[PDB]
Amino acid sequence: HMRIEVKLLPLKDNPILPFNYNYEVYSQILEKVNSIEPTIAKLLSSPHGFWTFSRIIVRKRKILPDKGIEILSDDVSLYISSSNEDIIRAIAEAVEKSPEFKIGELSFLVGDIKAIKVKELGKENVFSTLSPIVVRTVKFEGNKLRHWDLYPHDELFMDRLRKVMILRYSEVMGETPKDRDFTIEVLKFKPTRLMVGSSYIRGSLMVFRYAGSEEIARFGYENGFGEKTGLGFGMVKLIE
RNA sequence: GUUGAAAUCAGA
Numbered sequence: 001h002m003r004i005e006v007k008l009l010p011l012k013d014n015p016i017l018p019f020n021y022n023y024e025v026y027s028q029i030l031e032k033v034n035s036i037e038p039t040i041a042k043l044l045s046s047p048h049g050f051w052t053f054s055r056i057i058v059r060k061r062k063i064l065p066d067k068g069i070e071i072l073s074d075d076v077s078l079y080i081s082s083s084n085e086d087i088i089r090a091i092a093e094a095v096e097k098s099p100e101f102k103i104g105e106l107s108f109l110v111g112d113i114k115a116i117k118v119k120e121l122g123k124e125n126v127f128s129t130l131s132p133i134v135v136r137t138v139k140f141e142g143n144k145l146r147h148w149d150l151y152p153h154d155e156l157f158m159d160r161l162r163k164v165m166i167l168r169y170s171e172v173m174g175e176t177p178k179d180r181d182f183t184i185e186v187l188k189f190k191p192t193r194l195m196v197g198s199s200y201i202r203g204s205l206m207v208f209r210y211a212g213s214e215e216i217a218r219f220g221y222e223n224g225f226g227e228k229t230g231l232g233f234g235m236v237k238l239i240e
Numbered sequence: 241g242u243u244g245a246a247a248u249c250a251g252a
Contacts, residue, residue, distance in 0.1 A: 019247055065247045193249045207244055237241045
C-alpha cells in the first residue's frame with residue numbers, strides 16, 4: 001500500500017488551474033520517470049493500471065467556469081498510489097530530479113514529498129473518489145466503433161467493473177484472485193467529463209460502500225478502481 | 241486525503 005502525497009507550489013499568484021490536466025500530468029511523470037528508470041516507465045504506460053493518481057487537489061479554491069480552478073492556497077497536492085513500491089519509489093526520485101511541471105499556461109514546482117499513513121481495510125469499506133472512476137464498453141454508432149462510457153446507474157456497470165477488476169488483478173498481481181465477488185452501493189454520485197488529448201472520457205465521481213473480496217478491495221485501493229487508472233482515474237480515499 | 245468533489249457532457 002505505498003501511497004505518496006507530492007506537494008506542488010504554483011509559480012506567481014492568481015494561479016489558474018485548467019479543468020482538464022490528466023494527459024499532461026500523466027505524460028510528464030512518464031518522461032521524468034523514463035530518465036531514471038526506463039524499465040518502470042513501461043509499467044506506468046501499461047493499459048492495465050499498475051498505478052493510479054488523483055485530481056490535482058486545491059484546498060482553498062474557487063470555480064471560474066470558463067477558465068478553471070483559481071488557487072487561493074499556497075499549495076496544491078497530487079496523490080500517487082500503487083501496489084508496487086518500486087513504482088512509487090521511482091516516481092518519488094524522478095519527480096525530485098525534475099521538479100518542474102507545466103499544465104496549460106501554469107507552472108508548478110515539486111515541493112515536499114510525503115509517504116502516507118494508511119488505515120487498514122475492513123470487511124466492508126466506504127470509499128470516496130479522489131479522481132473519477134471510468135468503466136467503458138464498445139458500441140456501434142452507424143458504421144463506426146465508439147467508446148461508450150458507463151455510470152453506476154447503467155445495468156452493465158456492475159457487470160463490467162467486476163470483469164475489469166478481475167482482469168486487471170491477474171495482469172498486475174500475476175494470478176487471478178481467489179475471491180472474485182464484490183458488490184458496491186452508491187451513496188453519492190456525480191458525472192464528469194475529461195478531455196484527455198483528442199478524446200473525451202466520461203466517468204463517475206462517487207462515494208460508495210464496497211462489500212466483497214478482500215483482495216480486490218485492496219487492489220483498487222492501491223491501483224485505483226475501473227479503467228484508465230494510469231491516466232489519473234479511479235483513485236480512492238478510504239473513509240468511515 | 242480541509243474534494244461528500246470541478247466547469248464542460250456522446251465529440252467529426
